[PDB]
Short mmCIF file of C-alpha atoms and ligand atoms in Angstrom, two decimals:
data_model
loop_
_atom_site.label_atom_id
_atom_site.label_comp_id
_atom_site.label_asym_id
_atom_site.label_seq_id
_atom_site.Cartn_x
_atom_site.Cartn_y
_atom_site.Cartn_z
CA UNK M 1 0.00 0.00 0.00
CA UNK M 2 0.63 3.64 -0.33
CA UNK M 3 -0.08 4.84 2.88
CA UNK M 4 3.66 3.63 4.54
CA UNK M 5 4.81 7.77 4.04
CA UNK M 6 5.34 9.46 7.39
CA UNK M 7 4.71 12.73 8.82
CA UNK M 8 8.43 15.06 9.81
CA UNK M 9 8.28 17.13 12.81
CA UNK M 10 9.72 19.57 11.19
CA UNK M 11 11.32 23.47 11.22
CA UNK M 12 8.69 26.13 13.45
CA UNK M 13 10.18 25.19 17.07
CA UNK M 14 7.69 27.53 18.36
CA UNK M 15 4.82 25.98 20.57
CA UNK M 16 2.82 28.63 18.51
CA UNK M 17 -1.05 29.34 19.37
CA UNK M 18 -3.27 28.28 16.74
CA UNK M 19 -4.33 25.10 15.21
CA UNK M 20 -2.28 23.82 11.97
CA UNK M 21 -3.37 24.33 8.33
CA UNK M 22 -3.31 21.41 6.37
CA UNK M 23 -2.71 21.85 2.87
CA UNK M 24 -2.73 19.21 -0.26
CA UNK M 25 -1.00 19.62 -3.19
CA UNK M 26 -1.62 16.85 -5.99
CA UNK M 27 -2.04 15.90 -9.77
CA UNK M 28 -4.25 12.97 -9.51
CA UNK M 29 -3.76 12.21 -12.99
CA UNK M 30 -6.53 13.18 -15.95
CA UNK M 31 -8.52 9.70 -16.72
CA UNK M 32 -8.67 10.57 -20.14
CA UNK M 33 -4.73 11.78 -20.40
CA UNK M 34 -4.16 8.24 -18.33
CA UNK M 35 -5.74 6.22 -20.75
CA UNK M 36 -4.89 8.28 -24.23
CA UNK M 37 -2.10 10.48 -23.99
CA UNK M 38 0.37 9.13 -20.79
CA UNK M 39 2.38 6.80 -21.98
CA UNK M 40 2.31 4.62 -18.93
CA UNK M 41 4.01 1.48 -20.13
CA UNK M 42 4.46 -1.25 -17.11
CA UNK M 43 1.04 0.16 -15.24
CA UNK M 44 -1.90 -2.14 -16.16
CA UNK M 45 -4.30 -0.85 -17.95
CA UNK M 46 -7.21 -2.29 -15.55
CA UNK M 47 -5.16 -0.13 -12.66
CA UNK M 48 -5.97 2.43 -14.94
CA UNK M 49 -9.81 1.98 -14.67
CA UNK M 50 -11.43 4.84 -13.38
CA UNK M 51 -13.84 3.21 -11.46
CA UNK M 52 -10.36 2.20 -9.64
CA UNK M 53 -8.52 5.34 -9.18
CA UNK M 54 -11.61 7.61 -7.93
CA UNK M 55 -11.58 4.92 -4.63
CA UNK M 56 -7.64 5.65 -4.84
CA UNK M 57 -8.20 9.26 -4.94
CA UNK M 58 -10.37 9.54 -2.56
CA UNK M 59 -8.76 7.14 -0.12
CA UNK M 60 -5.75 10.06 -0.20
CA UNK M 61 -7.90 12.92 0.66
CA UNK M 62 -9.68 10.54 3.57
CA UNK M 63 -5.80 9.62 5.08
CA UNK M 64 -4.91 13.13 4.86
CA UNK M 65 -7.45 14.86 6.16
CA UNK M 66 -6.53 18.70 4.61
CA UNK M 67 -8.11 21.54 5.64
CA UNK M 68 -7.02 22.60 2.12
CA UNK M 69 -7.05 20.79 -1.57
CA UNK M 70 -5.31 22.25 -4.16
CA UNK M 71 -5.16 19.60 -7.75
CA UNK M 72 -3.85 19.44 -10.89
CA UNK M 73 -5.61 17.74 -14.25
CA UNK M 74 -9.22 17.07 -13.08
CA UNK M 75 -11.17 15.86 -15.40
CA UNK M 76 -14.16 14.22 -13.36
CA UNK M 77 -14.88 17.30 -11.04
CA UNK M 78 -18.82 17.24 -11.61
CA UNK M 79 -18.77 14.00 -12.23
CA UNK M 80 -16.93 12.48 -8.76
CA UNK M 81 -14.93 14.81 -6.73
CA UNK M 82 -17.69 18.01 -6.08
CA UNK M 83 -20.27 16.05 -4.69
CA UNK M 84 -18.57 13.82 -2.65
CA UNK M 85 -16.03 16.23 -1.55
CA UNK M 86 -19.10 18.65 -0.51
CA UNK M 87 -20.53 15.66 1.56
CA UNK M 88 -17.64 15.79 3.43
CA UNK M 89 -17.52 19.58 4.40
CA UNK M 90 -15.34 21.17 1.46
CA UNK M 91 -16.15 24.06 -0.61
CA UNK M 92 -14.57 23.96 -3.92
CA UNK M 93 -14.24 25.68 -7.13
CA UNK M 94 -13.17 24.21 -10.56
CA UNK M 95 -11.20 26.18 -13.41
CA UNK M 96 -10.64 24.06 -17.15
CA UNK M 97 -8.38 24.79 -18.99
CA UNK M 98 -9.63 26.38 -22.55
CA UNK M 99 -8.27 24.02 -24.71
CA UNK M 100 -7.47 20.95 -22.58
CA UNK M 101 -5.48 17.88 -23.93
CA UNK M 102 -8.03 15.59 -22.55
CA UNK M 103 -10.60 16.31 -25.45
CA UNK M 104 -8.35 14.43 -27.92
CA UNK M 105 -8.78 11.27 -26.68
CA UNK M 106 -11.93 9.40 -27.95
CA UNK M 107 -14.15 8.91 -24.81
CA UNK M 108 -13.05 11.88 -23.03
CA UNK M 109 -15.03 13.15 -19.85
CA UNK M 110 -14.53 16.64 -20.82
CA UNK M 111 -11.54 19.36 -20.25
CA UNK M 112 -9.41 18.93 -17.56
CA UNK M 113 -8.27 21.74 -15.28
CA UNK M 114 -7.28 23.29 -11.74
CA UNK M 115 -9.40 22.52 -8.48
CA UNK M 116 -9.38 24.41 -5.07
CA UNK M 117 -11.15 22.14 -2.12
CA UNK M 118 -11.17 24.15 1.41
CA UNK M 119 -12.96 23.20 4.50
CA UNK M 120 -16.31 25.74 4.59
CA UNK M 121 -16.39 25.01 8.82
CA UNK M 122 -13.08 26.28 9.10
CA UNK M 123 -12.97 29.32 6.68
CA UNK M 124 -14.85 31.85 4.95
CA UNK M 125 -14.13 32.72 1.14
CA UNK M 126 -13.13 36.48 1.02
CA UNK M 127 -12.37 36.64 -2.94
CA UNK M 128 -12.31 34.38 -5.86
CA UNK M 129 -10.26 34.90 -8.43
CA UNK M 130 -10.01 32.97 -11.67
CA UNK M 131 -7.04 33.76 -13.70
CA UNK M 132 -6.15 32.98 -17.12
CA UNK M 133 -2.06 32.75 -17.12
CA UNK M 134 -0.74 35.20 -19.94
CA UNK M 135 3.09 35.86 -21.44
CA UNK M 136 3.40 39.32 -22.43
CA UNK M 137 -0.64 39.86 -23.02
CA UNK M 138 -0.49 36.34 -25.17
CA UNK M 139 -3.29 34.27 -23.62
CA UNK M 140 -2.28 30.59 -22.61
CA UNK M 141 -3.87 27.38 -22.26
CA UNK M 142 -3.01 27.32 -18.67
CA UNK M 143 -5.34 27.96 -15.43
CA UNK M 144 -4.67 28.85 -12.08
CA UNK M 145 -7.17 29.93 -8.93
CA UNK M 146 -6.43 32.12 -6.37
CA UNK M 147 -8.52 32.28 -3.14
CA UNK M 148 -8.57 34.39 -0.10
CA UNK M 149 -9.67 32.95 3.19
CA UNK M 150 -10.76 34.05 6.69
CA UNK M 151 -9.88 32.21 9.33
CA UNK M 152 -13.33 31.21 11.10
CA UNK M 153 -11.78 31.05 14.38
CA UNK M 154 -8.72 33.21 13.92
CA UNK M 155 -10.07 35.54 11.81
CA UNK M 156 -6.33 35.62 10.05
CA UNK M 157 -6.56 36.11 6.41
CA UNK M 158 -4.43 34.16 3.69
CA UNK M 159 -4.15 33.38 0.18
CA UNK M 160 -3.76 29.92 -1.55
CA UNK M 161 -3.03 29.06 -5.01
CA UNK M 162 -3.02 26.64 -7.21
CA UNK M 163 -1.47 25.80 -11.00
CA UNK M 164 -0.54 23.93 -13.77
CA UNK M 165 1.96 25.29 -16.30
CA UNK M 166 2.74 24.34 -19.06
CA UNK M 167 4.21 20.88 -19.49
CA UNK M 168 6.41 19.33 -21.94
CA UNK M 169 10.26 20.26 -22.93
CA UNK M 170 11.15 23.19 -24.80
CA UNK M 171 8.60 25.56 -22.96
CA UNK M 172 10.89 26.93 -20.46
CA UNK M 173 10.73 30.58 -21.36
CA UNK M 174 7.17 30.27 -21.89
CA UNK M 175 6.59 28.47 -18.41
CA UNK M 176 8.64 31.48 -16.77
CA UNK M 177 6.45 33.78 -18.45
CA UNK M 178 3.44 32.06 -17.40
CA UNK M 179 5.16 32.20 -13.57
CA UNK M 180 5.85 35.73 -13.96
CA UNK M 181 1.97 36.73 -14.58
CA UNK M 182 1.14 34.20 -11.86
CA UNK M 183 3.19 36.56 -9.40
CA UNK M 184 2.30 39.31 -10.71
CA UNK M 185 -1.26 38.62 -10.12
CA UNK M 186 -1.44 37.33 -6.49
CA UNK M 187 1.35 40.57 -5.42
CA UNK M 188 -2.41 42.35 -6.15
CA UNK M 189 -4.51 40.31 -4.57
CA UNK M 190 -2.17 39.31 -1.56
CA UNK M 191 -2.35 43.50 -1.17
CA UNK M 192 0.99 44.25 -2.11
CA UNK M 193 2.33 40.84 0.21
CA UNK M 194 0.60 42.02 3.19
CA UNK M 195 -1.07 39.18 3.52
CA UNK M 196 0.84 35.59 3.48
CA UNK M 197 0.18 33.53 0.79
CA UNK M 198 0.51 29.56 0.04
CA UNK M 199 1.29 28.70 -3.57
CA UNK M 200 0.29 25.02 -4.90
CA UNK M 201 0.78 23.54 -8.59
CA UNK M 202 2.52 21.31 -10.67
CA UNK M 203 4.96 23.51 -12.02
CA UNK M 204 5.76 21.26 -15.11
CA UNK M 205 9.91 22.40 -14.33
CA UNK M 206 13.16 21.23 -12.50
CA UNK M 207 14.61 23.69 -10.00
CA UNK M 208 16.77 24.45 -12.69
CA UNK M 209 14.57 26.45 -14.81
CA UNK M 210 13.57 30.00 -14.72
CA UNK M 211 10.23 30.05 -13.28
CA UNK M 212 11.59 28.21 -10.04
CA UNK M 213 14.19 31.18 -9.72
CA UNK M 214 11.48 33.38 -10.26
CA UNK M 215 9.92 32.23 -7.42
CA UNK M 216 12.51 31.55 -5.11
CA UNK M 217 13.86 35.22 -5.45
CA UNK M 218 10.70 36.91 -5.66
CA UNK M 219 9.55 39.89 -3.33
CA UNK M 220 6.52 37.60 -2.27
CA UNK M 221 9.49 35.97 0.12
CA UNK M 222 7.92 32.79 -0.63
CA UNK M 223 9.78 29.27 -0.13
CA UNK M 224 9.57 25.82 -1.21
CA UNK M 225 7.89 23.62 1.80
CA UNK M 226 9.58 20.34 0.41
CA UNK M 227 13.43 21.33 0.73
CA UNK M 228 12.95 21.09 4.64
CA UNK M 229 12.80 17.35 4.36
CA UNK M 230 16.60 17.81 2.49
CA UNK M 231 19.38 17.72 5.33
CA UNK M 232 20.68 21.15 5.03
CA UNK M 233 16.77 22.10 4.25
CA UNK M 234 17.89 23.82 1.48
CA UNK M 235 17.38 21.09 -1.41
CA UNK M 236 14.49 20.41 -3.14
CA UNK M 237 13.40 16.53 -3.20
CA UNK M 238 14.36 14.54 -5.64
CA UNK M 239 11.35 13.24 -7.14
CA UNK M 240 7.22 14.36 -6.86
CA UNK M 241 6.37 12.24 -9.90
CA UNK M 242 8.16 8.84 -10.94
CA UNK M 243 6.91 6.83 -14.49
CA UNK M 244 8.10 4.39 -17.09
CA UNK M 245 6.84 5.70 -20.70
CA UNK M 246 7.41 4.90 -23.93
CA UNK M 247 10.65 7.26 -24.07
CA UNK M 248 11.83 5.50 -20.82
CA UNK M 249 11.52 6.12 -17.01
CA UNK M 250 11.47 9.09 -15.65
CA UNK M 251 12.01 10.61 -12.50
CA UNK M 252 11.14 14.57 -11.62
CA UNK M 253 10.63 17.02 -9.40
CA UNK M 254 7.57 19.22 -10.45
CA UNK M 255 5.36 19.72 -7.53
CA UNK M 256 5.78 22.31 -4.74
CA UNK M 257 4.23 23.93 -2.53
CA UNK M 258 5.42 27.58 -1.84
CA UNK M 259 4.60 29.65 1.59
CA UNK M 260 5.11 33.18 2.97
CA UNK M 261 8.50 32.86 4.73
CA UNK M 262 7.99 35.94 7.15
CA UNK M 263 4.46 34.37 7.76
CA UNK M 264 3.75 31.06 7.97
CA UNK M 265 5.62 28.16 9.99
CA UNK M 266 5.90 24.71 8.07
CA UNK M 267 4.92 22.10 10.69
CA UNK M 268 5.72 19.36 9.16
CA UNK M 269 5.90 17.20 5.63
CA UNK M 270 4.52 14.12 3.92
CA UNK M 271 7.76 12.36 2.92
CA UNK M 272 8.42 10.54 0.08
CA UNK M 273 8.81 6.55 -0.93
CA UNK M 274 11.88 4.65 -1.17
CA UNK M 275 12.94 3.22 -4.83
CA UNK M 276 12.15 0.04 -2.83
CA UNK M 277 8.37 1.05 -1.27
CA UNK M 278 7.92 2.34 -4.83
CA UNK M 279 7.82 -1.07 -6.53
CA UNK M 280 10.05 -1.42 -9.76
CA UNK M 281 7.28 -0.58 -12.15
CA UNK M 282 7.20 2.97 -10.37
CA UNK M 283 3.60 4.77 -10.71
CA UNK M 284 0.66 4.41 -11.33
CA UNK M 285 -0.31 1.18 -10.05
CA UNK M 286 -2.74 -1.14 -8.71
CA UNK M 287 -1.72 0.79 -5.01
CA UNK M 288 -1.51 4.63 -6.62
CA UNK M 289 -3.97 6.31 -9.16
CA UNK M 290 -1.38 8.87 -10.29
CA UNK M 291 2.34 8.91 -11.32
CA UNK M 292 2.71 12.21 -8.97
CA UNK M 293 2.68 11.60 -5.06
CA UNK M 294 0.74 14.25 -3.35
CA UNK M 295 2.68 16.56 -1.70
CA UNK M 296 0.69 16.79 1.80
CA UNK M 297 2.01 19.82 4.81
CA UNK M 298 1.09 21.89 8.14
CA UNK M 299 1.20 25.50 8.59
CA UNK M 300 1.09 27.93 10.87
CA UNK M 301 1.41 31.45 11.30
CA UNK M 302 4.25 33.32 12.75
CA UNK M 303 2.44 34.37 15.92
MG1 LIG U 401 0.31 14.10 -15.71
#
């Protein structure tokens, strides 16, 4: 099974008031990308079954227990993931993407896209806001949401986002482009970074590219959750999505989840399998309905 990943104690030190935020960051894998375009190899194609990866799916948000959802490439959000998810206390709010990838395959359920999943008991939506990535004005097929919520019991106000860039190779400048308006739009609706701010998405890049500098050095002060589980804390992981295609296996780091340093304590962090836990045949499998793990932390305020 899956659910062998532990829970680090992890950086704040401080005994600090308020109760933790729990926030998921995943891309549960599009059914129809799954089945048409991903080039999953050594997975069986009856562990592919949707029927099959919704329990999967849902069995991670049940282990979990986040107080926030924040997922990449759903294509069943009417169909599965609203109503249940709604039964079980979460507000949510879905965002396709225009021309999704999903509509090319032959019995598609529809465009794929962005979802944003918070716990209504615990917080209040302030603002919505749906934004359509652009590079230089040029309109992209990417999506991303950004939220403001209220703290029900707090009444601290924050910001969480969440994205999906653009994907394959060769779309490096375009993906730090895409970044760029991404920052540029939540430095307006954080207030100018008054207001901390938690950053979710498949980011479709290494730390090597542009768009992760971007991030790293921008004036948001925002960090990358996932390099405290490093030893110096400094390095990012080195895998949040591990597959066998057609090309070969691969093994990246694409998922993060950034945080307002000066803001918001990280509490601790789901860590990730062993080559050995992982099975040979990496993901998906019969045990794991996408070939990214979900990247799963707790936060806290400064104070
Ligand atoms: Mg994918």
């Amino acid at each position: 099974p899956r659910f062998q990943r532990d829970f680090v104690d992890l950086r704040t030190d401080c005994p600090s008031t308020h109760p933790p935020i729990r926030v998921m960051q995943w891309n549960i894998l599009a059914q129809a990308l799954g089945e048409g375009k991903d080039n999953f190899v050594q997975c069986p194609v009856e562990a592919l079954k949707w029927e099959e990866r919704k329990c999967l799916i849902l069995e991670e948000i049940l282990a979990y227990q986040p107080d926030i959802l924040c997922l990449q490439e759903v294509d069943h959000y009417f169909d599965t993931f609203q109503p249940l998810l709604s039964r079980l206390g979460y507000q949510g709010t879905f965002f396709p993407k225009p021309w999704s990838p999903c509509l090319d395959v032959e019995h598609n359920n529809g465009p794929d896209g962005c979802a944003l999943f918070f716990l209504q008991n615990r917080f209040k939506l302030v603002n919505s806001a749906n934004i359509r990535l652009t590079a230089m004005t040029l309109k992209t097929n990417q999506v991303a949401i950004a939220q403001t919520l209220e703290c029900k019991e707090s009444g601290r106000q924050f910001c969480i986002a969440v994205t999906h860039l653009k994907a394959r190779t060769g779309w490096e400048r375009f993906r730090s482009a895409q970044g760029c308006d991404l920052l540029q739009n939540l430095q307006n609706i954080t207030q100018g970074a008054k207001i901390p701010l938690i950053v979710c998405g498949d980011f479709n890049a290494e730390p090597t590219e542009e768009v992760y500098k971007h991030f790293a050095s921008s004036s948001l002060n925002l960090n990358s959750a996932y390099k405290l589980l490093s030893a110096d804390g400094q390095s990012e992981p080195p895998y949040t999505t591990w597959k066998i295609r057609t090309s070969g296996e691969c093994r990246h780091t694409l998922d993060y989840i950034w945080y307002s340093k000066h803001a918001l304590n990280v509490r601790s962090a789901l860590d990730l399998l062993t080559e050995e836990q992982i099975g040979p045949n990496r993901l998906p499998s019969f045990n794991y309905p996408s070939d990214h793990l979900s990247l799963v932390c707790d936060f806290s305020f400064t104070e």
